[PDB]
């Protein structure tokens, strides 16, 4: 089969230019159209453009036509996406896709639709620097079902991983998706519902890890 391997994720400051690569391995690289499809967090898919390497026929979407540049390197079977004048609203996952073939090889006409996708490339456009999170305790109230947790506030960039009691606590745990605060820093919450009777006997510590800033916080949560 064919597979597309994209470059790693990167963070770019607003106004700069980013270049995403996409290496293809399998069928003919020259006669099948290579496209780029981005997707903002939580939002839908958006077609950006495509290129047919054999005749170098590119086709851009009018929304990006002017700062986008898609080329195809037939020497290394690698397509390149260059996005200029970056702005925070371009923060998305960039996918490289290639049109499918009719079944298999040699006698295989192109079908147009995207049958082969890359693993994706995360591009975060922000004017923020790497910052470790502050972990504050969401203490349970003074039946039946009591809630506690830890607030993971003001960090950059994604992601942050949270476990409970070194992983020994999983049942009833909810780690919500992070939100982008106006400060340009992320903030998530990790809660857990437990029996009220266990509040005064069971120790609840949350393990918060933030790889980019190399931060590891074990915050203990107890009733006020």
């Amino acid at each position: 089969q064919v597979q597309l391997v994209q470059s790693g994720a990167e963070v770019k400051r607003p106004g700069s230019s980013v270049t995403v690569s996409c290496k293809a391995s399998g069928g003919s690289f020259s006669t099948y159209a290579l496209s780029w499809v981005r997707q903002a967090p939580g939002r839908g898919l958006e077609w950006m453009g495509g290129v047919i390497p054999l005749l170098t026929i590119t086709n851009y979407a009018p929304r990006f036509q002017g700062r986008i540049t898609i080329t195809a390197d037939r020497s290394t079977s690698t397509a390149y996406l260059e996005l200029n004048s970056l702005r925070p609203e371009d923060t998305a996952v960039y996918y490289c896709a290639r049109e499918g073939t009719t079944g298999w090889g040699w006698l295989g006409k192109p079908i147009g639709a995207f049958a082969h996708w890359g693993q994706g490339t995360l591009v975060t456009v922000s004017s923020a620097s790497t910052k470790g999170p502050s972990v504050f305790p969401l203490a349970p109230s003074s039946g039946g079902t009591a809630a506690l947790g830890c607030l993971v506030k003001d960090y950059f960039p994604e992601p942050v991983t949270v476990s409970w009691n070194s992983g020994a606590l999983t049942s009833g745990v909810h780690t919500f998706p992070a939100v982008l605060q106006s400060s340009g820093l992320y903030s998530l919450s990790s809660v857990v519902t437990v029996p009220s009777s266990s509040l005064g006997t069971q120790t609840y510590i949350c393990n918060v890890n933030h790889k980019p800033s190399n931060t590891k916080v074990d915050k203990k949560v107890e009733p006020k």
Binding site: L45, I111, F136, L138, G149, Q181
Partner: protein, 214 residues
């Protein structure tokens, strides 16, 4: 530009049921070049249907494409546990390719009222100058719920941000977390901090509240 409008936005069905999803084009799609994709969280889209009706090798026969012109339809004969995801429709009849906004297919279950909790800002965070009050809506269905912040019984609007977890693989419910963020100064100007939640499974709006320092 061709505009694709998918319907409905969300699809509440149960495993074993038939699912039909609609895709309406603004203008006629040339040569019926309409495709259907499936996407799960943290994963690239997967080609289900192309050419409005053809199905690539490796796709279950419960997926069938139909329709022509401006009206297209994806049909799942019998829903399977892993078929609950997001489904996008794409036209490529014109050179300029466009997508729909997508249709989420969720598991439908009995309406469940959320268990509401409220969390005052920690003494630790108050030393930094900021105050974050966290309202938690635990295990509810459907996803449609409203959270309104009230400080000294006054509708707060523009200082809160909420996020929702994906539908649980066990009880098929959702959980919402809304965080109200004030400065320490503004926080100490008031007393009663309350979060009001309105949901289908609740006859009357439920309000959870605390008094600052009490």
């Amino acid at each position: 530009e061709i505009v694709l409008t998918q319907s409905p936005g969300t699809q509440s069905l149960s495993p074993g049921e038939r699912a039909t999803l609609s895709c309406r084009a603004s203008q006629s799609v040339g040569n019926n070049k309409l495709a259907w994709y499936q996407q799960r969280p943290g994963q690239a889209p997967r080609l289900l249907i192309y050419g409005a009706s053809s199905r690539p090798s490796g796709v279950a026969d419960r997926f069938s494409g139909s329709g022509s012109g401006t009206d297209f339809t994806l049909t799942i004969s019998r829903l399977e546990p892993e078929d609950f995801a997001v489904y996008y429709c794409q036209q490529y009849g014109q050179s300029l390719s466009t997508f729909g906004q997508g249709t989420k297919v969720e598991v439908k279950r009995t309406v469940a009222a959320p268990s509401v909790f409220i969390f005052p800002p920690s003494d630790e965070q108050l030393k930094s100058g900021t105050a974050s009050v966290v309202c938690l809506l635990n295990n509810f269905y459907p996803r449609e719920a409203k959270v309104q912040w009230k400080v000294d019984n006054a509708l707060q609007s523009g200082n809160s941000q909420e996020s929702v977890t994906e539908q649980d693989s066990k009880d098929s419910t959702y959980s919402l977390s809304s965080t109200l963020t004030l400065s320490k100064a503004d926080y100490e100007k008031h007393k009663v901090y309350a979060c009001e939640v309105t949901h289908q499974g609740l006859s009357s709006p439920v309000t959870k509240s605390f008094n600052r320092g009490e």
